[PDB]
Every structure is written in structure tokens, then in C-alpha cells.
Amino acid sequence: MFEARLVQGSILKKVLEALKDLINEACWDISSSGVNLQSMDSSHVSLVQLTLRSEGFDTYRCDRNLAMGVNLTSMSKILKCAGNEDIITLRAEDNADTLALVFEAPNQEKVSDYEMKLMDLDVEQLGIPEQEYSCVVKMPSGEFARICRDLSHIGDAVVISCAKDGVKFSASGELGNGNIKLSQTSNVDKEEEAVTIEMNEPVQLTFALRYLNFFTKATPLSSTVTLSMSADVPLVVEYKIADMGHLKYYLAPKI
Amino acid sequence: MFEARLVQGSILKKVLEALKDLINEACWDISSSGVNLQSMDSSHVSLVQLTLRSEGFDTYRCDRNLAMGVNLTSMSKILKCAGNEDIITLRAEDNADTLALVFEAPNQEKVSDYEMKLMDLDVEQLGIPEQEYSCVVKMPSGEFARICRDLSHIGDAVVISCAKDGVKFSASGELGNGNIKLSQTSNVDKEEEAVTIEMNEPVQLTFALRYLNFFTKATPLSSTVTLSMSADVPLVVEYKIADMGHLKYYLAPKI
Amino acid sequence: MFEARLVQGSILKKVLEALKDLINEACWDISSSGVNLQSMDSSHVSLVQLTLRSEGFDTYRCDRNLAMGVNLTSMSKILKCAGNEDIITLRAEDNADTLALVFEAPNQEKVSDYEMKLMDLDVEQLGIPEQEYSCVVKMPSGEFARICRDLSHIGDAVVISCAKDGVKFSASGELGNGNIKLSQTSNVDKEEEAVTIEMNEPVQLTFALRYLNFFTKATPLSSTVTLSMSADVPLVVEYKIADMGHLKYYLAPKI
Numbered sequence: 001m002f003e004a005r006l007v008q009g010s011i012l013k014k015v016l017e018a019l020k021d022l023i024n025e026a027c028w029d030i031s032s033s034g035v036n037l038q039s040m041d042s043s044h045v046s047l048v049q050l051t052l053r054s055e056g057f058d059t060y061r062c063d064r065n066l067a068m069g070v071n072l073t074s075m076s077k078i079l080k081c082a083g084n085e086d087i088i089t090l091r092a093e094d095n096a097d098t099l100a101l102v103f104e105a106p107n108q109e110k111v112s113d114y115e116m117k118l119m120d121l122d123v124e125q126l127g128i129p130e131q132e133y134s135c136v137v138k139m140p141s142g143e144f145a146r147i148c149r150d151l152s153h154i155g156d157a158v159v160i161s162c163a164k165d166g167v168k169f170s171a172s173g174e175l176g177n178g179n180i181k182l183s184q185t186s187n188v189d190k191e192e193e194a195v196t197i198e199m200n201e202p203v204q205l206t207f208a209l210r211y212l213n214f215f216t217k218a219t220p221l222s223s224t225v226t227l228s229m230s231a232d233v234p235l236v237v238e239y240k241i242a243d244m245g246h247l248k249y250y251l252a253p254k255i
Numbered sequence: 256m257f258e259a260r261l262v263q264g265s266i267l268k269k270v271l272e273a274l275k276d277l278i279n280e281a282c283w284d285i286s287s288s289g290v291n292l293q294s295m296d297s298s299h300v301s302l303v304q305l306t307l308r309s310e311g312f313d314t315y316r317c318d319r320n321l322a323m324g325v326n327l328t329s330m331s332k333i334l335k336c337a338g339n340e341d342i343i344t345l346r347a348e349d350n351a352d353t354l355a356l357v358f359e360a361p362n363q364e365k366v367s368d369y370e371m372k373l374m375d376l377d378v379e380q381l382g383i384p385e386q387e388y389s390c391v392v393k394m395p396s397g398e399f400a401r402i403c404r405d406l407s408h409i410g411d412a413v414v415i416s417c418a419k420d421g422v423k424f425s426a427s428g429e430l431g432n433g434n435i436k437l438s439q440t441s442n443v444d445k446e447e448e449a450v451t452i453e454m455n456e457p458v459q460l461t462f463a464l465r466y467l468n469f470f471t472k473a474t475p476l477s478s479t480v481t482l483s484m485s486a487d488v489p490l491v492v493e494y495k496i497a498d499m500g501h502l503k504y505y506l507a508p509k510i
Numbered sequence: 511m512f513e514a515r516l517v518q519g520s521i522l523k524k525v526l527e528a529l530k531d532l533i534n535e536a537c538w539d540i541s542s543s544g545v546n547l548q549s550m551d552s553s554h555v556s557l558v559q560l561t562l563r564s565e566g567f568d569t570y571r572c573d574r575n576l577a578m579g580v581n582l583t584s585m586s587k588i589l590k591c592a593g594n595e596d597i598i599t600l601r602a603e604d605n606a607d608t609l610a611l612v613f614e615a616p617n618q619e620k621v622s623d624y625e626m627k628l629m630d631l632d633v634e635q636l637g638i639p640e641q642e643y644s645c646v647v648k649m650p651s652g653e654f655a656r657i658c659r660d661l662s663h664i665g666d667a668v669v670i671s672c673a674k675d676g677v678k679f680s681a682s683g684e685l686g687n688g689n690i691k692l693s694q695t696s697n698v699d700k701e702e703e704a705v706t707i708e709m710n711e712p713v714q715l716t717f718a719l720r721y722l723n724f725f726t727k728a729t730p731l732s733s734t735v736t737l738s739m740s741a742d743v744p745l746v747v748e749y750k751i752a753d754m755g756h757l758k759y760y761l762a763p764k765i
Binding site: 353366367369372 | 653660663684685686689691692693701703
């Protein structure tokens with residue numbers, strides 16, 4: 001038996017809401033150390049890596065490594081039947097072709113029990129080259145979402161320029177161009193309002209806005225986001241999942 | 256002649272919003288004891304029965320029993336035009352076949368006078384007698400609304416199974432299957448957000464989920480809903496209309 | 511050079527919201543006396559005329575009259591990017607391309623520099639010249655908005671009847687008919703409905719409700735609206751924008 005009881009159900013709701021548009025199907029690599037997902041998106045452009053560590057779960061049980069192939073659109077639909085404050089328990093027999101999802105209200109008067117059909121899929125594998133990056137921008141998650149959205153009216157691509165004297169997002173198109181300059185803070189007082197740049201050398205990279213606008217569906221999961229960049233390698237957009245792990249999205253620059 | 260004055264016109268806005276999707280035209284039986292509507296949907300699976308007592312109105316007079324044929328699409332349109340806190344007055348002179356509806360804004364600035372056909376058409380008048388039911392379930396209306404909404408993502412039918420210690424709703428379909436068990440809870444005193452059962456013998460019936468989703472548009476009219484059920488007879492779904500009367504939806508099971 | 515600055519970002523946004531569904535490509539006349547926009551809408555039915563005097567901006571400089579051809583949907587989008595508390599700067603250097611729109615958030619965290627390509631359109635004019643009208647009605651803007659919206663459920667045309675009593679809007683279609691009567695009560699009254707009317711002779715004209723429902727998108731720009739009517743000429747619906755300027759709509763009555 002695999003069995004994982006997650007007390008804050010909102011978290012799994014949000015993860016599915018952040019993945020279902022970008023990718024339709026993917027295998028859930030389950031083990032004693034946690035749950036891990038790794039997939040390309042459905043247009044073969046970006047890469048996604050999800051991690052939810054075992055200890056994040058209130059109760060956790062994994063007799064042996066499972067791989068469950070999963071339609072995320074169906075999984076999301078089922079999770080929309082969960083409340084935000086439900087305790088969600090995930091359960092699969094060792095080689096069973098189903099995943100049960102139990103949504104307990106907090107007072108135990110209402111209990112729901114769903115049994116999802118798996119789909120049978122060939123796993124993907126990479127993980128990408130772990131790297132020391134030139135720039136790391138930490139910033140509010142709501143601010144990053146709004147920027148990508150604003151600039152998507154102007155252009156299909158965004159140039160992210162970092163230097164010592166700031167970060168800048170620029171886009172360009174048929175109706176013109178725009179530049180959004182977001183200043184580092186010093187003493188912001190809260191921690192989650194900070195804009196901090198860890199800079200080694202200036203960098204200027206171009207990314208497809210369409211894909212960044214997918215990545216920002218993870219905003220509910222965290223109040224900050226970090227962007228790690230270096231020349232000619234994929235951007236990582238990282239959202240922390242409430243002490244349990246993370247959702248990274250990798251994207252090639254143009255060129 | 257007919258005239259009924261209702262100071263809390265918000266109630267009548269809620270009833271028409273409850274009726275307009277399911278039923279398109281209906282007979283309005285007006286008498287000195289009040290308003291009684293009764294109709295099948297255009298597909299013959301369900302029946303609605305509405306009752307508004309004369310004493311529920313601020314003023315009421317009926318000279319003359321009347322069977323006004325009414326287009327509920329058109330009446331819901333006109334009611335849209337009413338303020339939330341307008342006084343609503345319904346009116347019919349005699350050998351005129353028109354229903355007038357007068358909305359007087361809260362601080363007598365503005366009177367709106369509306370009038371609609373009153374197409375007296377070949378119709379019905381059933382009733383169907385008092386039955387004794389195997390189960391009667393009372394529960395919060397918003398909770399029944401939620402279970403019908405969520406299960407409609409899974410299948411197009413719901414098995415309702417009643418038992419001493421609770422009621423279950425189960426559905427099955429494309430993306431897998433689902434059951435929601437609500438427990439009898441007692442409490443009472445501080446609120447009736449309870450789930451109570453009255454069980455002479457257990458019941459187990461399948462119903463059309465889309466119809467139950469029409470019925471739940473009445474959710475805003477009452478904090479609770481009752482479900483009376485028996486083998487082979489139509490389910491009743493009752494909503495109380497704040498000390499003026501009731502709204503009952505009737506649905507026959509399958510097989 | 512042209513340059514204008516405003517603290518009231520919001521007003522600009524509301525002007526574009528109120529124009530952009532009626533007209534696509536527009537020509538802004540920028541002179542030293544201010545900004546002027548005059549155009550038919552894209553169906554050649556109604557006429558719009560916007561005026562924003564130079565004094566209404568808290569800085570204003572214009573060396574040379576410019577005719578800046580803009581797509582109003584694209585400019586509404588851009589202005590959607592700005593904080594409602596943002597300081598806005600409009601800037602152009604004289605012709606081809608660049609209108610620059612700069613949004614500076616209140617305390618210096620964020621600056622947004624946009625640049626809109628201008629197309630070459632001729633500066634229109636015609637400026638149909640003023641008149642004394644049989645009848646001039648002034649009323650709450652949100653009440654005028656609500657009357658057009660509601661009657662649009664009954665009919666496609668409204669008949670405005672002005673009289674010493676007050677003003678009456680009446681519409682008629684398939685479902686039946688409706689009239690709304692606002693009366694002149696005296697003075698010193700709490701209700702915000704002091705509908706006032708300056709009158710030479712009762713008028714009675716019909717108007718397409720589709721277009722009136724375009725003109726009420728200006729509702730946020732002012733709390734009152736003034737209607738000016740005579741037989742055989744266009745209605746004028748005027749929103750005064752706070753001694754900054756005005757937005758006028760012209761619609762001819764049905765024959």
C-alpha cells in the first residue's frame with residue numbers, strides 16, 4: 001500500500017491548478033522519500049519538476065516504488081470537489097490501476113471517496129543540469145504574475161535584464177513596446193515584500209511570455225518566486241510549497 | 256380583480272430565479288387563500304409545485320379565482336428590473352388578461368410599471384396525493400447544492416442510499432467514481448445545520464443529476480432542504496419560503 | 511514636444527473604457543488648449559466627442575498641434591497596466607510612433623514605460639454646433655444607466671417622454687411593456703434622486719437602447735448625466751468630467 005495523508009488539502013488543489021493547463025499527462029513517481037513529478041509540457045517546450053517530501057505529510061506510507069500515470073485534467077476535476085480545509089488522503093494498492101482520493105472535512109461529518117482511473121504512459125527522464133546561476137532575483141509572486149500579464153499585451157517575448165542597479169522586464173511587438181523596472185528594496189519589513197538581486201555578472205535573456213504566463217498559475221502556492229538565470233541555459237521559476245517542497249518550471253532562452 | 260403587495264420583494268426575485276431554467280410557462284392559480292403554481296418541465300421528468308399564502312403578503316385581495324397562463328421567461332426578465340429593496344405589487348384587472356408588476360423604489364423616487372401577456376393556454380392540474388415516505392432527510396441547503404454540483408463532474412446520475420446512520424450519494428463515469436457520505440448529526444439548539452434522518456426502511460434510488468442541479472437554484476430561499484424518498488415514487492425536494500409557503504420539486508427515479 | 515502629467519490615472523482609464531467598444535481607431539487632436547477626440551462609432555451610427563482641457567492636467571505642454579492615430583483597445587489595455595494611484599505621464603515628440611505612457615507607483619518601487627505606435631490618420635472635426643433644445647433633463651448617472659439596462663430586457667427601443675411632471679422611459683417588445691417614471695420632488699431631500707428639468711415644450715422621442723447602453727459605460731466619470739432633446743435632432747448625453755472636460759454622445763432618434 002501507498003498511503004499519504006495531507007492535512008492542508010488546499011496545497012494539492014493548487015498544485016493541480018498550476019499544472020493542468022501546461023501538461024495533460026505525466027507519471028507520478030512515488031517512493032518512501034516523497035512524491036516527485038518530472039515532465040515536459042504538451043507542446044514539448046518547457047520542463048516541470050514537482051516535489052512533495054514525505055515528511056510534509058501528516059501520515060506517510062510507501063511499501064515500494066510506484067509509478068502512476070495520471071490525467072491531470074481528471075485529477076484537478078476531482079480535486080475541485082475537495083474543500084480548501086479538507087484533509088486529503090491519497091491511496092493506491094501496490095500494482096493497482098487506480099488512485100483513491102479521500103476528502104475528509106475537519107469535523108468528520110462529511111467524507112468523500114473518489115477513485116480515479118489511471119492512464120498507462122511511458123515515463124520521461126531528465127532532471128536537468130544543476131547549476132550555479134549568474135543572477136537570482138527574489139520577488140513577490142503577485143508582482144511577477146502581473147508583470148508577465150501586462151507585457152503579454154505588447155509582445156510575445158520578454159527580455160529580463162539584471163544588473164547591479166536593478167532588474168528590468170521589456171517586451172516588444174506590432175503596437176510598440178514596454179519596460180517595467182522593479183527596484184530592489186532595502187528594509188521592507190515583512191520578508192515577503194522584498195526584491196533582492198544576487199548578481200555575479202549582468203545578464204540579458206529573452207523568454208516566450210506565453211510559457212511564463214503558464215508558470216504564474218502557481219502563484220497561490222507561495223508569496224515569493226525566485227528567478228535563476230545564466231547565459232544560454234534554462235530559466236528556473238521556483239515556487240516553494242509551504243515547507244513540503246517545490247515547483248520549478250524550466251524554460252530555454254531564445255538563442 | 257387581483258392585487259398582492261410584497262414589501263420584501265427580494266423573495267419573489269429568488270423564486271423566479273429558482274424556476275426560470277427548469278420551466279418556461281406555467282399556470283398561476285390565484286385565490287383568496289393565495290398563489291399556487293404547478294408545472295412539468297419541457298421533457299416530462301420533473302414537476303414543480305409553488306405555494307405562497309395570502310397572509311404572507313403585506314396586502315392581499317382576490318375577487319375571483321383565476322388561472323393565469325404565464326411565461327416564466329418573461330416574468331423573470333421583468334423581475335430582473337426590480338430593485339433588491341423595492342416594494343413589489345402584483346396586479347390584474349379582470350376582463351383584461353394582463354399581469355401588471357409595480358416596483359416602488361425605497362425612497363419614493365421612481366415607480367416602474369410592467370405588464371405581460373397572460374396567455375391562457377391548454378394546460379394541466381395534478382397535485383398527486385400525500386404519501387408516506389421510507390426516508391426523509393433534512394440537511395443544509397448549501398450542502399446539498401455542493402454535493403450535486405461536485406458529483407456532476409463525475410457522472411450524470413446519483414445513487415442516493417439512506418440508512419440509520421447517514422446518507423450516501425454515489426456517481427460513476429468517465430473519469431472514475433465517487434461517494435459522499437454525510438453522517439447523521441444531532442446537536443440542534445445553537446443551529447440546525449444538522450443532518451437528520453427519519454428512516455422506516457432503507458432506500459436506494461438513482462436520479463438524474465442535471466435535474467437536481469436545476470432544483471438547487473432555490474438554495475437562496477431557505478437555509479435547509481428536505482429529501483423525502485421511497486421505492487418507485489418521485490423524490491420530493493422541499494424548500495421553505497420564509498413564512499409565506501413552500502417550493503417542491505419532484506423527480507422520478509430510474510429503472 | 512507634447513507632455514502632460516496627471517495624478518488621476520483613474521480618469522484616463524475610465525475614458526478609454528467608455529470609448530473603446532464604440533470606436534477602434536481614433537485621432538487625438540493635441541493642442542495647447544488641451545486634448546479633443548471626435549469620431550463616429552464603427553457602425554457609423556452615433557457620434558462621440560471628448561474634450562480634456564490643458565488646465566485639467568497638473569502639468570501641460572504642447573508646442574505644435576499633433577494628430578495621433580491610436581487604436582483605443584490597445585491603449586485601454588496599456589492603461590490597464592497602471593496602478594489606480596499611479597502618476598501618469600503622456601508624452602510624444604511630434605508624429606510617427608511614440609505616444610509614451612509612464613506609470614510611476616506612489617513611493618518609487620516601480621516604473622512602467624510603454625510606447626505605442628501611432629498610425630497616420632487625418633484629424634476629423636465637424637463639431638456639430640450648439641443649440642437650445644426643447645428639453646434638458648439632468649439626473650443621476652447610475653439611475654440612467656440602470657433604466658437603459660432594465661428596459662433592454664423588455665424592448666430594443668426606449669421612448670423618452672419629458673413633461674413638467676418629470677420624465678418617463680417606456681419600452682415595448684415581445685414579452686410585454688414597461689414604463690419608468692421619475693418625478694420632480696421639491697428640495698432638501700436625502701434620496702439621491704433630484705431629477706431636474708428645464709423645458710420649453712413636452713417632447714417625445716424614440717432611441718435605440720443598444721447605443722444608449724454603450725454611452726452608460728461613462729457612468730464612473732460623473733455622478734450626473736444631462737440629456738438634451740428636440741424633435742428631428744440627435745440626443746446629447748453628456749458626462750461632465752470634474753471641470754477637466756466632458757464626454758458627449760450624439761444619437762439620432764428613430765424616424
